[PDB]
Design a protein around this ligand. Structure first.
Ligand code: VPS
Length: 270
């Protein structure tokens, strides 16, 4: 819980679902009483959508009861003014979807495998804690550190918070989030379960293999609906080394989707 007076808003970085995102600075007393001015990620709920404030905050709160090297750090909230603001660590290299687009001509199978293994590790941690994320996608993966072939250092990613839950979002927004949202949640958003994240994880691997293309982007909401109704799978990406794993995770039967331990074992065997 942070004071408005300790936060300075700077440039807009974009928007999420019913939110606006800004780079910012938090003035804080840190360890040993040292004063720090810390770059922060600020997510502001749209005032016009103040109805979603509880879910907006339950999303960040749920994940911050657990600590983990691959889960993004949340500093707190500022409920100052009429604004609802999430204060989050600022990651140097932004989200994975934009990173994959701007760097497509420099991302090989080894880089992808390390990113997929780290994301599976985070999801395995969540599965063991029976915590549903609900919005696994490339936009919610943050790149802390780039790969450095010189020092052999692999990339390092974190999973960000899910945003407002699909269990309260309007149906046309859910439909636009096909194929990250699983078919059982399109049928009924309250079908959100651990198996939800395995499907979305599969969709996210497709993103990682497709240079930041969005799967099914050419299809409007009604065609996305019918895609599920006809039980189609995503096309294999040209870089097809993860296609079987993608299809295994994107199983129309939720009970058949493999555990993240089995997913990690599959990744390790490639
Ligand atoms: N250029 C650049 C750049 C560099 C660093 C960040 N840092 C950061 N940090 C955190 N915790 N979360 C995010 O989410 C976002 C939100 C909006 C857009 C994007 C994106 O990739 O454009 C990412 N971004 C963001 C952008």
């Amino acid at each position: 819980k942070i004071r408005n007076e300790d936060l300075i808003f700077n440039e807009s970085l974009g928007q999420g679902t019913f939110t606006k995102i800004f780079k910012g600075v938090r003035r804080e007393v840190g360890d040993y009483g040292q004063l720090h001015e810390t770059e922060v990620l600020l997510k502001v709920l749209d005032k016009a959508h103040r109805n979603y404030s509880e879910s907006f905050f339950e999303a960040a709160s749920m994940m911050s009861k657990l600590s983990h090297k691959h889960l993004v750090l949340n500093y707190g909230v500022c409920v100052c003014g009429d604004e609802n603001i999430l204060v989050q660590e600022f990651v140097k290299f932004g989200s994975l979807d934009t990173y994959l687009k701007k760097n497509k001509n420099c991302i090989n199978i080894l880089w992808k495998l390390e990113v997929a293994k780290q994301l599976a590790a985070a999801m395995h941690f969540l599965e063991e804690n029976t915590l549903i994320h609900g919005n696994v996608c490339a936009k919610n993966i943050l790149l802390i550190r780039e790969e450095d072939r010189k020092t052999g250092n692999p990339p390092f990613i974190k999973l960000s918070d899910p945003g407002i839950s699909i269990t309260v979002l309007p149906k046309d927004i859910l439909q636009e989030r096909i194929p990250w949202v699983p078919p059982e949640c399109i049928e009924n958003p309250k079908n959100l379960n651990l198996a939800t994240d395995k499907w979305s994880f599969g969709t996210t691997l497709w993103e990682i293999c497709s240079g930041g293309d969005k799967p099914l982007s050419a299809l409007d909401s009604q065609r996305k609906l019918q895609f599920y109704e006809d039980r189609h799978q995503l096309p294999a990406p040209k870089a097809a080394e993860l296609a079987n794993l993608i299809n295994n995770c994107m199983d129309y039967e939720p009970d058949h989707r493999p555990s993240f331990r089995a997913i990690i074992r599959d990744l390790n065997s490639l």
